[PDB]
Amino acid sequence: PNFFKMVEGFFDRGASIVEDKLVEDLRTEEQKRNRVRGILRIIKPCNHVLSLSFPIRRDDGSWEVIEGYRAQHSQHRTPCKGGIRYSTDVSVDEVKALASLMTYKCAVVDVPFGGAKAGVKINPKNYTDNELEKITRRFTMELAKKGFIGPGIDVPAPDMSTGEREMSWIADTYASTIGHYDINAHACVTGKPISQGGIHGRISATGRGVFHGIENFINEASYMSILGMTDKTFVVQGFGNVGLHSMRYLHRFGAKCIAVGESDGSIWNPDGIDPKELEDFKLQHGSILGFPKAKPYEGSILEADCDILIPAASEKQLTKSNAPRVKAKIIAEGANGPTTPEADKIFLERNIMVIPDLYLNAGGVTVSYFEWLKNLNHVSYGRLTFKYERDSNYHLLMSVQESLERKFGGGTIPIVPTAEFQDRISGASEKDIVHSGLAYTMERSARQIMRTAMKYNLGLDLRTAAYVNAIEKVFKVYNEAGVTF
Amino acid sequence: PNFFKMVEGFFDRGASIVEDKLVEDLRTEEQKRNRVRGILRIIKPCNHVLSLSFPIRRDDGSWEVIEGYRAQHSQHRTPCKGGIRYSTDVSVDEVKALASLMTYKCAVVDVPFGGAKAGVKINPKNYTDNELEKITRRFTMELAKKGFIGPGIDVPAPDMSTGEREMSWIADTYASTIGHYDINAHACVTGKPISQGGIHGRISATGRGVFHGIENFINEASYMSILGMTPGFGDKTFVVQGFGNVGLHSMRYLHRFGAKCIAVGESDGSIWNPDGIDPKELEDFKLQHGSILGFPKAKPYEGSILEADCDILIPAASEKQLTKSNAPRVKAKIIAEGANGPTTPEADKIFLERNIMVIPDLYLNAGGVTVSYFEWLKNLNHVSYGRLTFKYERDSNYHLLMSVQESLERKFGGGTIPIVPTAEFQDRISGASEKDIVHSGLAYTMERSARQIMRTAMKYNLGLDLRTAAYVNAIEKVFKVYNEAGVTF
Amino acid sequence: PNFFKMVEGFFDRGASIVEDKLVEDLRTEEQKRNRVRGILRIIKPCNHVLSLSFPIRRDDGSWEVIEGYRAQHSQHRTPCKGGIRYSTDVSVDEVKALASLMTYKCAVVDVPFGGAKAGVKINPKNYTDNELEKITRRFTMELAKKGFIGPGIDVPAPDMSTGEREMSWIADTYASTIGHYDINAHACVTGKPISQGGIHGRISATGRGVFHGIENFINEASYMSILGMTDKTFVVQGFGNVGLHSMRYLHRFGAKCIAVGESDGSIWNPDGIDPKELEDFKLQHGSILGFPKAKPYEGSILEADCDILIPAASEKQLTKSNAPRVKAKIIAEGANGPTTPEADKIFLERNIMVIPDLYLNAGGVTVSYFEWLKNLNHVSYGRLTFKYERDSNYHLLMSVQESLERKFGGGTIPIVPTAEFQDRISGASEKDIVHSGLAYTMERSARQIMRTAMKYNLGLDLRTAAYVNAIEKVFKVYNEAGVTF
Amino acid sequence: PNFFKMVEGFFDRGASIVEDKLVEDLRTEEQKRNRVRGILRIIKPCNHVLSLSFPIRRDDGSWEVIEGYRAQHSQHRTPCKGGIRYSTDVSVDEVKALASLMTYKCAVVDVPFGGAKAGVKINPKNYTDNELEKITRRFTMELAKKGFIGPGIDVPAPDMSTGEREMSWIADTYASTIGHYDINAHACVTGKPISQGGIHGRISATGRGVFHGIENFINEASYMSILGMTPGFGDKTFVVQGFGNVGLHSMRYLHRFGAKCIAVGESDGSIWNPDGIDPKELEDFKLQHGSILGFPKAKPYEGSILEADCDILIPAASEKQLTKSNAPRVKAKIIAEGANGPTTPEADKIFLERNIMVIPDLYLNAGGVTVSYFEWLKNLNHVSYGRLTFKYERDSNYHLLMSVQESLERKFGGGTIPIVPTAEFQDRISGASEKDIVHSGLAYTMERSARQIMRTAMKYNLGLDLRTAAYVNAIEKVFKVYNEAGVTF
């Protein structure tokens, strides 16, 4: 099944679960609150979708026509968010499903954004950089002229097929053509380079978010008692950006990586694998094929014995066929939909915890929200507070020193910070604020999801709990908005 | 086949015909003129397509979701034009094809508009007036928030499933919600009632358009010689298939100029009378009760009237009435396509085989678009036509007549009175209004377009294939507009 | 001298002449009306001057910097008007002087426009059409971003070094980038092709204007009595579009072209020269050299014996040296400033009428005004009125016929129009309206100039009369506007 | 030589130095990296120059015409910044040079602003306050109508010939006439009074910035080893050559940190006292009457103080005080260019010959720009700094101290009172205000810019030639934005 059917079924199950509690526990008459559940019918379909067909010039003087799509799901929050994907396999159904997923993903982590998606039916490898720039600029103009690019309307973001260069082109085009009089013309897109208004810590956002999401659940006694846990052993399937950063952060906190797999052959080592050496080997030449101090493991690493499995790889790696054969007890969905609904039932039968992808990989969205806020503030974070905070800390330490010296009759110096504190003070930067905000958001969302799961007497079915929480959050806004006209 | 295939084939045939002339004797290099023909492949696809799903609340406290579509084809003329259809059988393909047709229809009659189409998947029979009004308000707001309703962007028009009431609702919504600061907020739609800014003569626009289209071609001796007829009206015979507003007005206007209507058809049984049928009596009978069934002085003709012997046939009815099956059986030598797409390409080939003149629907029924353009201009002018000129023209005419009278009196020693206008001219002077100006403009446009189409057909050595001539003319105009604008940006 | 000093001296003399009469008989206090003449010193200087320096990328991957200037003289009328020149010898002084001249030229013919001028320091012969288009687009963007291109602010027009292609590019740029939401985005520039929103009869505007200007003065008995004239003989120097059209219309109206000059050798024929044959010969190959039925005249045609001389050619053809040697009683300044002030005094000494260039060549400005009005109306002229007028004419003729038939017992047919009337009815178009309006404007301006010249006891010094009229017209607007606060 | 040629030469030398390293591996095709250096030639010229001539009515019923100029250099950052000058010597060249300098000055201290300058050829001493106000209003309106005043476009700042009254008038005019619908209409100008939206600590901005700039370099042991001095202000002495705002504040802040002033100069006779001079007493004496002439406990030094033996010299005075003639006679090893370009290019060679450090004026006197940036941010935030955080911080501090007290009492178990802060910390808590935040941000910006300049100077193997290092750093920063922007077509 495709993602469209999966998300439709997930939303239907969530609505069916939540409606019974929603009718009574939240309403004010005539028992017609069930007739109000038509609000749930409003949320499901996508509000807007637009199809574009525009020409470009091409370097050899021949004209070409390019097709694109842009879907906006919900306008219950004014600014919409979503990525742009350059691929020949794009379609209206895919962008609609991804836009629908985006609203729930944003609502889970309490980000006041809508949902949107964009796709251009193009092959990046078949074009020159000049042609790509022309395509991006024309696409930006076409979206702007119909109200789909505005800083207070819709804020596009990069995807796996595009990069910060395209975002820089989009921002320049919008700020030079349409948003000339707008004071916030540079907040119309996210993912820009630092020189163009980007934010620090954007590269390692998703891996850090995945690490925090795993840490929040792994430290709860109630779930570990059910799972029989609490050292740490994890296996990552995929060595992209997300997998690399997730492995780095997990290993930094005292976890051992047993196996690493990719599209080609895998790697296995009981003693553990150093993330830095593996990264250097991968950057040196091609893939990790031939890494020293590592054995060429045969077969799928999914069945390998480990405490944590991170399938940060291609679509629906886990299916009903290989579901009963896995040995990992905790699965952290690093990618979008690595498991099939049948596999979910199989895992739930044998009490296998599955952390939903709707919550785990929202670090990128959170950092995009932070970058949008920074662009609106017209100033980097912490520029006006670092020196003042340092002075306050030194004053506090001196106060403690003087108070202690005034009680015990000479040599007492509490004013010396620790080595880590001294490094934190000296190397203060903007990315510290971003990381702290990301950790806070992940912790709060994990707590909310746990409470929602407890409320509805759900077990290890965290996906349904997250969907129910998102549906409740959206329904509250629709209900209290009054519905215009 | 569906209309999408027919319009795609027509455009492909027109482009193939025109490219040969368009490459060589058009412009100023390196023989890259065959490489700039890519401009043509820019014209074919639609530029923008949008689909909406919006909620309303029913009268019984229940909620519902309504789906709609809006397609804009070309932006070479930034005011886009198109109708809105309320029907449960709408689809993206239909609105795309209709917008593509509207672009060429506007280009043929030299109307500086683009092409657009809108459809709402709702049947009007299952809703009350309040629910319909709420649906129109929400649809207008949704289109406004995305840039599809603006007076300088897109001007919707009524269709067969909607009326002036919906247009009034849309105009009020736009003028009260989004276009509050716009001085031309009431020019966002056409077809409004006269009290809301409508134009006179809008009801009978298509009938006059069809009548003028037939009259222009029927007076050309070159084509009459080919068809073996006599030029001009009089002693002519025409049969109308369908008795809507278009057919009724066309029959009235044809009978006014000395034509005899022999048969009138409809969904139910038909009519036949060699002596002719009076349009006024038939209209009164139809308005009295139900259909024209049982009309006095009318033999209940049996069988399809399409094969009846007549000089002119007007298929103003449902789509593709004429097919390859009944093509070799018709007896009419001139066919005037009142409606959109009443014939199939095989039927057109059969007619060309037996030199049967077919007036294209792309040009014949374009009077409504012209009158909508005039209404848009009137809304922009903030004044009705002729308000500041009628009395001045009357004074000038009287001064001219008095001058002639005095000059004639200066030559002869009795009393001459040339200052007396004719009865027709006196009635014209007394009853001066806006509809006279509207009808004169419509006639002028229909004459110019017909002359241009005939010249284009002569240029490309085409015979009675006026459809391809019209398509070639429209493609030439659109290509010129693109080419002289610099294209690249 | 330079034209900056020329226009400064002309304005100073005009203001000196006006001041005395203006003070006494214009207002209803303390005799301090003479202190209000500071209003005059407000009119003289230019209001705004802008200098632009923008980059482009050449065809061979090279970057270049292009400089330009735009001067706006007066804002007493909101829409400013002026040409754009592409030349390597442009300067701030030249554009300022031309902008100052434009205000008076517009005010003479009662056109509610200001004055402006633009220059770009580029040689058009060293650039590819793609490079020229890029330069035009960037220049339009730079002018738009600072408020110098708006349809209600400033409307550029073509010049000798630019054509309709540049104005098509300008209109496309403004309608696609800045004036997207403007309903009159295509009225921001004048001179566009007919397909892009141009007007008919624009090509032959200046020739008709010159012909009408000459005709209006040549039919005034008072001036011809002073000159002792009143068939017609004229000599034109220069064979541009202006000279060609002027010769065509003059020959059509019964005048004889004795000689024709150009940059190369001249042409002389006592029997006259046919404009059509000469135009065909010139278009066939190169110049008019070798034209049959044309003696190769040797020497300067300026001293040739003719009743009318039209110096529609290069700058400053008449000076104090050759002034006494001319034999033309009437000189019609087709071009901008072909006569020196000393030559003006010499001509005034021996009764030589000099029709000012300020009034003679305003046909282009008038037709530009008409095109701007047409673009604002969103419809061509006469589309809704031709059929109604034809019906009214036929009804009037039929009424006369029927009235004449009531007096006599066979058949009278007044319904038949004359051949010229029938041709006029059949070939009705927009150019007829444009030419009619141009003729009306020229006649009214000529009458106003004659009245102003008579009022101030001026003789054949029509230049000062025109300057006085323009100064009075501008001063009236400033005086009644309240001079703001 | 005028500043135009000096800045042209500085930019040319910086570009020539940076080109070789920039073409190389520092940036990532057919070896066209050397051919893209046209980007550099894009940066040098000014983008926009505007000249105005507007009328006013004088007090005695007479009209006058006033001319002015406004130059904008770079638009790589949308908000442009620059001062407005009132003097009858302004010209296009001067405003162009100052606007060009402003871009580099802003880029050095990492302030996202462009460069601009305005000059009105007027004499303030010959006009009544009413006439000056009318001139300011008309000038503001003229700049507004052409897009030169906008809060997101261009933000003017005061200068030596204009005060806060003019900027209050400008802000009132913009908020009342053009920016009526703008929510940030009061952010269109800086330097306003506090009651009109000004910021605290604006008066002493430049002196504090100069002090911080000197202090950053003084404590760097690597440079003091070359100069042969010792780090710290302990035994240092300074000679100020001016008594403006900059000179008044700089010496007060230096004395506050243990620096002794041995001499003070001005446009008149000097003062010499080895024991030191009190800034407060001298300021009070000057404010009491006239100049510092006749100050008690101050020997009336005769001669040029530029040659006086001192550790550091601060020439905050008129143009180009230091020249080639004076260069060999200076006994100060460190020169802090407090003013705007007081050193000729020739004298720099002599200073480099015998190891005399010259802190560039581009970086030293940039504190005013930073404080203007902070004021612009405050106007955008619609709230003063620290209003919602001052009370929370003291609660946090008291909770921390109480926690320490409780832990210490638990460990031992009579009474320990760590809760008491120090006297300076208690005074800081009691008198918390916005100027503390402003000064903290200024110090942070100066420290970061000094570190960046040192790193850039070390990178290109430059010695004590800090001016070229600063210019190279600014050029690199601007080129980064131009290169990564893609250059719109």
UniProtKB/Swiss-Prot annotation, chains B, D:
Pfam families, per database record: ELFV_dehydrog, ELFV_dehydrog_N
Key words of the record: Acetylation, ADP-ribosylation, ATP-binding, Disease variant, Endoplasmic reticulum, GTP-binding, Hydroxylation, Mitochondrion, NADP, Nucleotide-binding, Oxidoreductase, Phosphoprotein, Transit peptide
Enzyme class: oxidoreductase
Residues annotated with N6-(2-hydroxyisobutyryl)lysine modification: 81
Reaction equations catalysed: L-glutamate + NAD(+) + H2O = 2-oxoglutarate + NH4(+) + NADH + H(+); L-glutamate + NADP(+) + H2O = 2-oxoglutarate + NH4(+) + NADPH + H(+)
Annotated localization: Mitochondrion; Endoplasmic reticulum
GO CC entries: cytoplasm; endoplasmic reticulum; mitochondrial matrix; mitochondrion
Binding residues annotated for NAD(+), in chain numbering: 75-77, 110, 186, 378
Positions with a binding annotation for substrate: 81, 105, 372
Annotated consequence of substituting residue 256 to H: In HHF6; diminished sensitivity to GTP
ADP-ribosylcysteine: modified positions: 106
Key word Transit peptide present: yes
Binding site for GTP: 200, 204, 253, 256
Phosphothreonine modified-residue sites: 344
Active site residues of this protein: 117
InterPro entries referenced in this protein's UniProt entry, alphabetically: Aminoacid_DH-like_N_sf (IPR046346), Glu/Leu/Phe/Val/Trp_DH (IPR006095), Glu/Leu/Phe/Val/Trp_DH_C (IPR006096), Glu/Leu/Phe/Val/Trp_DH_dimer (IPR006097), Glu/Leu/Phe/Val_DH_AS (IPR033524), NAD(P)-bd_dom_sf (IPR036291), NAD_bind_Glu_DH (IPR033922)
Modified residues (N6-succinyllysine): 5, 21, 44, 96, 117, 125, 134, 280, 286, 297, 299, 324, 349, 391, 411, 435, 459, 477
Ligand binding (ADP): 384, 448
Gene3D superfamilies membership: 1.10.287.140, Leucine Dehydrogenase, chain A, domain 1, NAD(P)-binding Rossmann-like Domain
Post-translational modification: ADP-ribosylated by SIRT4, leading to inactivate glutamate dehydrogenase activity. Stoichiometry shows that ADP-ribosylation occurs in one subunit per catalytically active homohexamer.
Reported regulation of activity: Subject to allosteric regulation. Activated by ADP. Inhibited by GTP and ATP. ADP can occupy the NADH binding site and activate the enzyme. Inhibited by SIRT4. Inhibited by HADH.
Effect of residue 256 to C: In HHF6; diminished sensitivity to GTP
Quaternary organization: Homohexamer. Interacts with HADH; this interaction inhibits the activation of GLUD1.
PANTHER family for this protein: GLUTAMATE DEHYDROGENASE, GLUTAMATE DEHYDROGENASE 1, MITOCHONDRIAL
Involvement in disease: Hyperinsulinemic hypoglycemia, familial, 6: A form of hyperinsulinemic hypoglycemia, a clinically and genetically heterogeneous disorder characterized by inappropriate insulin secretion from the pancreatic beta-cells in the presence of low blood glucose levels. HHF6 is an autosomal dominant form characterized by hypoglycemia due to congenital hyperinsulinism combined with persistent hyperammonemia. Clinical features include loss of consciousness due to hypoglycemia, hypoglycemic seizures, and mental retardation.
Protein name in UniProt: Glutamate dehydrogenase 1, mitochondrial
Origin species: Homo sapiens
Classification lineage: Eukaryota, Metazoa, Chordata, Craniata, Vertebrata
Record gene name: GLUD1
